[PDB]
Amino acid sequence: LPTYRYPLELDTANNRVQVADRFGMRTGTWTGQLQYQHPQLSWRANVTLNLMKVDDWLVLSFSQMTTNSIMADGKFVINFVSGLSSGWQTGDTEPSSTIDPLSTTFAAVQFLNNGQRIDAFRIMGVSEWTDGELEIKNYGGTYTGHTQVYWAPWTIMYPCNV
């Protein structure tokens, strides 16, 4: 007879050929340092983000965070080489294309200057993946002078295969 390949499954007790329930959901967590890169400023923040494999998509769920000041532009680097969950491979984070961007979102930000909290937005685009290193460009958005940045939770996803 034929066989089957994930997401395809053969149910024995039923003569059921179906699609794996886990295809639409596969949890994970990268625990590492979020690298902010710009030529005149660079810093790194300890973050622990959640991951979800949903069909042929990879979702990154950012939790609220407080970081150092950021420039008008910027890059965010995530080194998947180390930090992933149990059973998760660095290859499990590879995008299915080289198209730039692969997806763009906005982050709700607060530019903490003096005692002031400035509500502003920050556009984020999933740009590159190089030997386990994902590169999220921050094309810009709204900007004012500040000493720190408070980020509200946010999500980015991009196409991927398993």
């Binding site: 066989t3 390949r5 994930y6 997401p7 794996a20 886990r22 295809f23 596969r26 080489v81 180390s82 059973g87 998760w88 491979q89 660095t90 290859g91 499990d92 590879e94 190089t130 030997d131 386990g132 398993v162």
Partner: protein, 102 residues
């Protein structure tokens, strides 16, 4: 449920010589292989999704049996972790091959 092991868990080879690090595995329906290099602090990606990294493309060749190097220098010394995972991540295995360049 599955098995992931190495024929030679420790490998000592002279400088500028070829070397194959062997990754033997069984029990997988459709497996995914990954090779990572650890030298003290620095972790390096060599093989991911049955494909060699750009930084190792010119000298490393992948086979289900293992990774074959054309040449090795003092830099290449350290632990080489081989991870094999089933599609859908229900089963997975690890194995470390220590490489000592002489």
């Amino acid at each position: 449920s599955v098995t992931v092991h190495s024929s030679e868990p420790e490998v000592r080879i002279p400088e500028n010589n070829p070397v194959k690090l062997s990754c033997a595995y069984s029990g997988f329906s459709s497996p995914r292989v990954e090779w990572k290099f650890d030298q003290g602090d620095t972790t390096r990606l060599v093989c991911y999704n049955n494909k060699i990294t750009a930084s190792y493309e010119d000298r490393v060749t992948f086979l289900p049996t293992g990774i074959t190097f054309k040449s090795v220098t003092r830099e290449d010394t350290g632990t080489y972790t081989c991870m094999v995972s089933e599609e859908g991540g229900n089963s997975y295995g690890e194995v470390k091959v220590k490489l000592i360049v002489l």
